[PDB]
């Protein structure tokens, strides 16, 4: 019986995800937004406190990802490619700026499972972003000044987020786009009677990323809306205003995770 | 904060699945099959031994499920309805006949997550079965003698199982269809460096079903094949012989789980 | 080459749909609704006029279908099963009551193609309805008094319709359900430059159904709303009030189609 | 009653596709292949004849497409993005070399409808290709020598094509059949539209083109005939970006 996640199996192939290293390359459409500080604070786990400078600030990201491990798994895009929508909210952890992730949606089950292991609270959704093609022409925006990119996310057949950015200038400090570490919550419940309120796993974690790289980073303006949907709470973080729109490529490897 | 599974949230609505009770009503197309005893034995976890009488016997099931909890969630079929394919394999636990579930596929993420909590090693797949309609006519089989029903399962765009049954007569003892208790494995890994081989949760469990009911049960003949697929190991349990085909409605409630 | 729809092929198997007969068995959750008479009239093709008694009335249906033809195609549910949401609107054709279908959504491409051939203006969508299971218990409504059934439709990831019905009693006259014949529009455009407004096929048709049967028909109360969505116009027929809710099984065969007027 | 395709509507918004112009930008992973000449010939419509020099040759393409029209429709990727797998087969038209398209699969209904209008015999499928990301790293190949790309296509939950290319080195009109049947009794063998057409592309552009080696197989599937053009051997694999606009179609 081999495997990292279920199903465990004789050859360790059937598992939804094998053991790390997990490698990632993606393209991000991002929007800085501001919600009610109290609404953001309401989502925070016990160990985190509101950001004393930017409470209410968040970032919405729509990402086209490609995953691989040690065996050129990216040659199997029917399993290795997925699209993802998440928000993070500014917070502090012991006086240090961090980014809490309350909600995140993906269109792939393996990504969802790798997510839960990392503490990303992933559910299935349908996510899309405008793509730039280097050939150019009227079927594509330019990845440069004036380039417009749309993005959307749905869950259970309901639209939950719609966004648009217009690029203006290169990001002068690309590496600093990843400055705030992400905080997550590994959580796995119990089903034994009497224990439904006593999860087997429940721990605050900090995302650890190896060999992070950012390229082709652009900044501009942005529009963003969250839409009310049955069975979702994203829109309870209403967009009071939008800040910068961002477009960049992102790569890293995951082999570790810090339990806080 | 509130909720049973992730994401936890201010109102406990965004969670992929709320706490039990979980109620189920389903229609099952079932096929008894026989594979190599050694191939079946290779899938067994520590704690289970080969069945001394029927090693190699298993049952493939294709199910059209509807879920609900305490608030008429069946009124939201976009979330509550799903289709599922699984196999069980005859085994023994401490000299008692049981049914081990190595592989199971479902077309809904909430069902998948509830599955992991139960120890069902669910992955996403596309599952279909012929339906009988009371109105009759050339668009439907009869739920009765001569009625033919097809069923298929795919995962990652690859067909993994194809089945057909032809009904002959009512099941003589419908209550006995669910006689072998199902054994599963709750399993949730760690990502902390050095601990990828030390899962946080790893325990054999017995499925506990409340108020189990079966109706409209028919038996007849069957054909079943498992197809080799990249990233799957189902077809490593080759169908050497097909036994009985079954068609029945099934209902039960989940509130508990027995850790062995 | 062989085949009925594209792709045509050496063996006539690859086609999205073969020739009729097309057989259908389905379960319907239906809602009678009332919108603005002028909104309904705005969708009507040339040839149809407003209903002088019930202008603004329509019916929304959510259907779990199973298709088959001459070879037990229902044994291949990955191709033959699908879910469908449509509306019809009361109208008149030369003084006769008919039902115009402006919008319809389905989760299966073969159904979409067979639809286009019939003049049903089908697009892809995601459609669901609560199911009743004979075994009973807390996972299912009863198909009977008090039974509640929800239904929804989305397109392109946007929710466009949400419905609920509560059953009260058997339909008194099931034979008279959806008694208005359905009118559709076969339409296939041209792409040749200069001809983008000169479609190759453009004709009003009346749906012809063979051996129609209904069973297990119940009526009760209903709630229905259409939701605004980008790239959709369904919600421009706002539900001002709802009438009866319905639940029934439906079966028929298609082999024919009546052309009313070409272009 | 405005609109280009159905549904026609009061505002012309609900239609599956509006009128041209239709603009496209895409990335192609492709494989040249050789099947049995007689198998290719069996797919040919009236009006096309076997290629006297390369009968049996075809090309398989897996494409990640983005569409737009006159209103920045590419800002709505939930409708405007799609993935497509097709094959073409070498043939001749009136003594002249062309590429016949017998089979093609897309993951989007609007693309399927625009396809039928063009005479592409599109059905729904699930199509995927490896993507190259500029940022680089172990999650992506690098366009250039040694760069490896996989691609697959499925239909009705069945895998029908699997391909892989390895790039080595930097670097025919399509014929289709518009076809729309009749349902009126007695007329099921008498289609309302049935005409051979040549694809007309405006402002075509190709960029960043690479060729290399390739593997390709078509898998037998219920309800499909693609694998009845068995890949006997593969030629070149290739990778490139492609753009063009559609406003016209030539009836032959």
TrEMBL record, chains A, B:
Pfam families: ADC
GO molecular function: lyase activity
Binding site for pyruvate: 24, 114, 118, 122
Gene3D superfamilies with a match to the protein in the record: Acetoacetate decarboxylase-like
UniProt-listed InterPro entries: Acetoacetate_decarboxylase, ADC_dom_sf
Name assigned to this protein: Acetoacetate decarboxylase
Organism, scientific name: Streptomyces bingchenggensis (strain BCW-1)
Automatic annotation (TrEMBL), chain C:
A Pfam family reported for this protein in Swiss-Prot or TrEMBL: ADC
Sample GO molecular function, one term: lyase activity
InterPro entries xrefs: Acetoacetate_decarboxylase, ADC_dom_sf
Chain positions recorded as pyruvate binding sites: 24, 114, 118, 122
Protein name: Acetoacetate decarboxylase
Naturally occurring in which organism (per UniProt): Streptomyces bingchenggensis (strain BCW-1)
């Amino acid at each position: 019986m081999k495997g990292y996640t279920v199903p465990l199996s004789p050859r360790g192939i059937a598992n939804l995800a094998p053991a790390p290293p997990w490698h990632y390359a993606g393209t991000v459409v991002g929007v800085e937004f501001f919600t009610d500080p109290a609404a953001a604070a309401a989502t925070l786990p016990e160990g985190l406190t509101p950001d004393p400078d930017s409470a209410g600030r968040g970032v919405a990201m729509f990402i086209d990802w490609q995953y691989s491990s040690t065996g050129l798994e990216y040659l199997d895009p029917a399993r290795s490619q997925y699209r993802e929508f998440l928000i993070t909210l500014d917070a502090h952890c012991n006086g240090a700026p961090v980014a809490w992730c309350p909600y995140i949606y993906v269109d792939n089950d393996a990504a969802m499972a790798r997510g839960w292991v990392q503490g990303f609270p992933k559910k299935l959704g349908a996510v899309h972003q405008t793509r730039a093609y280097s050939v150019g022409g009227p079927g594509t925006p330019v990845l440069g000044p004036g380039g417009q990119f749309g993005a959307t996310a749905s869950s259970a057949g309901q639209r939950i987020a719609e966004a648009k950015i217009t690029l203006e200038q290169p990001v002068p400090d690309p590496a600093a786009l990843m400055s705030r570490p992400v905080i997550n919550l590994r959580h796995f419940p119990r089903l034994a009677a009497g224990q439904h309120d006593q999860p087997a796993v429940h721990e605050l974690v900090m995302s650890v990323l190896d060999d992070t790289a950012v390229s082709d980073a652009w900044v501009g303006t942005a529009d963003l809306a969250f839409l009310p949907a049955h069975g979702e709470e994203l829109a309870d973080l209403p967009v009071r205003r939008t800040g910068k729109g961002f477009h960049f490529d992102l790569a890293y490897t995951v082999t570790d995770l810090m339990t806080l």
